Paper text:
The temperate phage lambda, which infects the bacterium Escherichia coli, belongs to Siphoviridae. The virion of the lambda phage comprises an icosahedral head and a long flexible tail. The tail, which comprises the tail tube and tail tip, connects with the head through the neck. The neck–tail complex comprises a channel formed by stacked 12-fold and hexameric rings and a 3-fold symmetrical tip.
Each of the 32 rings of gpV is assembled by 6 copies of the major tail protein gpV wrapped around an oligomer of the tape measure protein gpH. The 32 rings form a right-handed helix with an axial rise of approximately 42 Å and a twist of approximately 17.5° for 2 adjacent rings. GpV has 2 distinctive domains: the N-terminal domain (gpVN, residues 3–156) and the C-terminal domain (gpVC, residues 157–246). The inner tube structure could be reconstructed to a resolution of 3.5 Å, which enabled us to build an atomic model of the gpVN domain (S1B). The gpVN domain comprises a β-sandwich flanked by an α-helix. The β-sandwich is inserted by an E-loop (residues 50–78) between β3 and β4 and by an O-loop (residues 24–38) between β1 and β2. Six copies of the β-sandwich form the core of the tail tube ring. The outer surface of the ring is formed by the α-helix and O-loop. The inner surface of the gpV ring mostly bears a negative charge, similar to the tail tubes of phages T5 and 80α, facilitating DNA transfer. The architecture of gpVN is structurally conserved across the phage tails.
Author numbering:
A (entry chain G), B (entry chain L), C (entry chain H), D (entry chain K), E (entry chain I), F (entry chain J), ...: 3 to 156
């Protein structure tokens, strides 16, 4: 039985792409109108980050130690590699996404029972060919706006 | 039997270079008037990519999180290393391609049954000499314009 | 029995986050009004540092050797990785800390019997997903002001 | 029997330096008036390369994908390491070549039966001393002008 | 029996820090008024260095080969890592040294029988926490002025 | 019997420093008035090098391939590491050389039977301390002017 | 919550233009009858200034140091650049303003919660066209009379 | 689909020059009898401006603050640089325009779907010659009379 | 401890404006009846200067070299930029100072322990708005009469 | 093959000076009786220009917008820098041209296949001396009369 | 040992100001009755200059080339910046010098062993305040009459 | 071997000053009675130039294009910077030249093998002092009359 409180191993994660019209953040737990990408081999989700903003004046009584405040936050790049299946409707959606410069919403569903939703556009579409290994399609997606992390809902 | 839906191993890929007059994108599956480069030993196809365009104004109410949109897409470099056979027609075509700065169309044919076509010019011509190994000719080709990915056709 | 004089092994370290209103530096040994982050796997405490300030004049009789003085000190970044438990209260506190840009005080309690207090804001919130390993939450916290090292109290 | 069509292993390569007056490119297959460097232990021939020249205008109807053309070609550096024999005539010729800044023609004769001619000047002259290994002299030669690759003659 | 002429192994080196008023360079061999840092686990002493000053004119007959002269000498950084014992006097002296920027004199005493004295201020104070290893305190000290090498006294 | 024509292993090399007044290049083979540094563990002699000087005009009929000529040659840095013996004469000479910014001549005598002479000034004086290894003194010397390589004499 | 006492970052500023009949200075805080310019990318508000008026007589007892008084004050030029949207009612108002030489009142509304009102006429209407950037309309407005600065109201 | 309300990127702009007899302002959207200049590489359209007319009397009660009104409006200079093709019809038209001092009507057609018309005479004709770049023809045109901005038509 | 003899760093400077009736120069060390401007980011104090007065006659025996004497001294402009807080009393005092043309006395109190007093009137009041930076108020004040430099009191 | 219609790169330009008696404009394509300047390193051809002539009257019904007409055209200055070869005949011709104030015709022959003829007199003759660069002679030539641009002949 | 014939580096220069009654030029080498300014951080000595006097008549046969003769020589300005120490005697002397206009003699003493004397009056007194840098006092002094260069005495 | 026909690098130039009685232009190649300035670091020789003289009449049939003729030629300023050696004869000669307003002849001798002679008087004598650089003496000389350029002799 899935349990948010206890740790969970990573095997079982799925990746989804939104198609349709509506609010992706409204009800991420249901899968109606969410297309799926199958056979993902690697997945490194985006890394939220922030910039230091220098908060110092000449008036300040003491200047021995620095003082800074948080600046402009920004979600990073979410990159995954998945096996090459050009006839699947899923990968045709990826290249239609790339060619038509657009921002859609993609979802990560962990075995924990939680859901993680981002919005972004695709930045790279690569491939690797080796004699004795499956042909892989590597994708990197750049996020915009505010992600809806998993522990907002509780 | 080739099947686009299922994954495929990489062994069996071929590389072809176009000679003649016509439309390379019109009918890549046909093999007429396509010269072939033989005995490739490595192949890393080009990586499509795009650069971010900053979309922010002073008016916008929310400025905590960054907002960006897709910019100018560009295919990358395709580099392959193939055994040195200076008397073969294909490699003389390669150096004729390099000396006379020109853009031609080269094709990658996967065991999957699909076809991948690019257009570009050659950027590097190298060599490696070792006592106990076959002399290899390393080539890097820079693409221009819009590639024709294999999954456009379906 | 804990002993500040003798060396100590690292196992037993704990991490805490301050909640409430008061003076964090006043009495850190008490554990009231301090929330705790559980199941930390790695921890690298911040690195205090300073930058050189050039102290030279044309008058100086001797200029063969350089002469410098200490400049502006600054505590560094504290980064720890801890197992992903989105339903636990501590990690919801972490993301509330991140979303609302703010500076709080976090505490490190060593097995030695001493306490190390910092003040800072959170800079990065990341995650790593692998098939056969526990999903981890990686955090980096940037410090401001003057830390209260353990060596002050004695 | 040497065969340009089939692949060949690297053992048997020789290095030569032109002395005399004439046209090096006219007839490289002959071995008269070509001094030889003996006992070479590594050799990496130069890498021909070119740089991109941006070909874009504001008029262009389509600017989604980049468009570039080939720029200025340039042969690279040829570097080889050969055992230190200061009393041999070839290495005295090398240092006379270095001290008097000048461009000569050096030749690489592969076991394949073909010949590769370059023109250039010497850039580095180094040495390595180790207790249990032969003292080596390392050379790097920078090319100018147009090389005469082996694939021209056929 | 210690002997400067013959080589010596490194085990047995000690590190000392000066407290009091006087001339550190006057009599470093005496051990009075020199506090000691105990249980060091690594030590890389500073590296004296100098920067080139370009000495060339337009008049000079020969300009094929470069000509330079020595510039401004400067001792480097001395960094050592020692086990964390916050209750010991030496490490409280270290943090008092760091907080109040100041230049003091520290001494390295080799098993050879010689003494090495520097003057400088502290630049970094770090820590490393691991589950199965002793907690270590890493210090880096930046020197100023002229060091008193051991090779002066003889 | 030493032989310049044939290769030689590196063991047996010696390093010398000139003291006195005269011409170092006049008679390097004689060993009078040449002080010696003993017990050297590593030695990497300097690397002669040159700068490319761009030789191109707008008039030139062809500009497809680059054309360059040799620029300003310069001997590099000669660095060696030798065991720490502060009571020996040679190393006191090294520190007297470093403190008094000066250019002297140092000699390398190979087992081949040849001699290599440089002129230069010292740039670094470092040390390494390890628990179970001999204390080593590392020196780097920067050369000026024209070296007298070994195969000038024949 | 907006607070005049504390500093505020600049993001969120809006620009407005008055249409109708009434007193612009009477009630700037309400937005009835105030048209808005949207998507402003840069904004540098006007710089109030004054002229020195020479106050000196021959009678004056001392003339060693100058003495001056304030002259005729004048608000400067307020210039902003906003993205080109010729179909918006807002930008048509700008060009109707320019063609019909007139003085109207424009308003700046800061995130602080305050309001800044000027009166003036337009001096420049420019444009910038770049291949990969949004077309921008640059405007400069020259002010007349007395501005109603933000801290008049309190 | 072109849309005046939304912002547009600059790529796709065209420049046209009128030939024939009629009213340029009557129907600029139609493309008949408008010659075209091809391959523009830069374009900075003219900047409308006005000069202040001093409106102050001695009678006025208030003279602390300046008061001015708009004077004589005047379109500025329009300068574009386009690749040198002396055999094309457009550039021969340019030099015929320059030699015979005359005022014609030139049109700028944006990707937005709008049209901008000016009237003026040519002021400069320049050229730039570089070894590795396309020879460019730089033109500056001075406008007279009243321009017809694109947003008059709606 | 403050010390006029030794050099001092700039952090800790304060700016004050005189309100009330009395003699500003009489006792500036006291802080009563002096309003304060808070949060100053930059400060460039005025530059005392003088202009040359030509002292030459036709009689002078020697006229090869020029001869001049000092003319009329004049303090310059003091300009500081401070964060925009329109609800604070100090900045309302600044704009009341500007609107009513008047000369008051403002004071600079250095960390050294000394005081620098000027008298003057305000010349410029400006502002700068940026998306990611604090809104700043820039002021310039022009001095009259004789300043009371800190070096007078001792 | 040269083609006036298509763009061309600049490499291959030549500079010529007319000697003899005849009509320079009659047949510039021929190369007889035209001396040549060799080894030019930069060349910026003259910039044709004209000045505005104010065309306004008090009668004019409308005076809101300015109205001007073209004035007196004038070719600008042609400046080129070429390597210093005082023994060559061309540069002796240049200085004879300068010393005897006179107007001759100089020609620019582009790689395009066209010819550009001017007439003018020389204004500046300069030189630049640097230690590691070729001595250059810089010339500026001022044109008179009507140039014969390449676009006339077709 | 100081040596006028050989070049010297700048470090070690001192600046002195004369107090007392006598002849400054009589014996500048002696240091009695010369006050000293301490801790200078920059120094750019004055630049002697002269202005051309036009020497041409209508009679002269040759008027192609200009002819001029030297006019009125004049020493320039000497400006130095030195650390702000208002309690030191030298800087109180500086402001006493400024307030009471007066010409005194100041001396520059180079490490070369020579002495440079000027006479002049002070023109500017400035200051720079920065958060992390030493407060500096910038002075500019204008010379009168004839300087006594160091090259006179020999 | 020096060669006037071919280009030459700048290193090796010398600067000379004439002392004695005779004709400087008669035999510049001989080096007798020519004093020398040593250790010059920079040298920019004078720039010959001319003034436009307007040649236009009302009678002229055409006035569309300007017509001008050469006016009064004039050699410019020759400036060089050389290291400060006040005890050397040449620099005492420079200051004797400056103090006694006079015109002498100075010579530039290029590595090409040619000679360049000017006549003029000195205009500036400056100096630059830096902590870590050689003290430099900067001189600017203004020329009169007719220079004797290098390619007059052939």
């Amino acid at each position: 039985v899935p349990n948010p409180t206890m740790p969970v191993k990573g095997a079982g994660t799925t990746l989804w792409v939104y198609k349709g019209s509506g609010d992706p953040y409204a009800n991420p737990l249901s899968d109606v109108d969410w297309s799926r990408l199958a056979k993902v081999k690697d997945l490194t989700p985006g890394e939220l980050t922030a910039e230091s903003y220098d908060d110092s004046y000449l008036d300040d009584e003491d200047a021995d130690w620095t003082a800074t405040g948080q600046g402009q936050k920004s979600a990073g790049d979410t990159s995954f590699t998945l096996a090459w299946m050009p006839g699947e409707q899923g990968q045709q959606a990826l290249l239609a996404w790339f060619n038509e410069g657009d921002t859609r919403a993609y979802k990560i569903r962990f075995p924990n029972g939680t859901v993680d939703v981002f919005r972004g556009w695709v930045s790279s579409i690569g491939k690797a060919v080796t004699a004795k290994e499956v042909i892989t399609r590597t994708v990197k997606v750049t996020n915009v706006g505010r992600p809806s992390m998993a522990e907002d809902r509780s």
